[PDB]
Amino acid sequence: KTHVQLSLPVLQVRDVLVRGFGDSVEEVLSEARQHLKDGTCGLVEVEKGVLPQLEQPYVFIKRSDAAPHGHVMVELVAELEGIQYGRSGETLGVLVPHVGEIPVAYRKVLLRK
To answer: Which of 29, 96, 101, 105 is the most buried (most CB within 10 A)?
Structure first.
């Protein structure tokens, strides 16, 4: 399938134990996609002071369309030193590894895979 229905645990930035996916744009996108498939991917909602507490490169989920079965359609865009790799809509949040942190909510998304 080109799209996959996921429910992503929404984590508080100060709970996050592994604050990024790796060390290159290509690695963080690769690792994000693997964790999304393996159900080991969390979402941090972006507000003032969140991104500086996470590790670059960042992986964002961004709205790709204006929401089948409650699931917002999203795609991945990476960012490193203010350059983004991808073009998409509004940020729903920043992806991080999930290693058992307790979420505050779930974000239903349809991921273009």
So the answer is: 96
Count how many domains the chain has.
1
- Residue of 85, 89, 98, 87 whose CA lies nearest to 41: 98
Give the CATH number for residue 58.
Answer: 2.30.30
What is the 3 state secondary structure string of the chain?
CCEEEEEEEECCHHHCCCCCCCCCHHHHHHHHHHHHHHCCEEEECCCCCCHHHCCCCEEEEEECCCCHHHCEEEEEEEEECCEEECCCCCEEEEEEECCCCCCCEEEEEEEEC
Residue appearing with tokens 């089948």: 68
As a whole number of angstroms, the distance between CA 101 and CA 103 comes to 6
* Cβ-contact 75, 33 below 8 angstroms: no
Among candidates 54, 9, 5, which has minimal Cα distance to 28?
Answer: 54
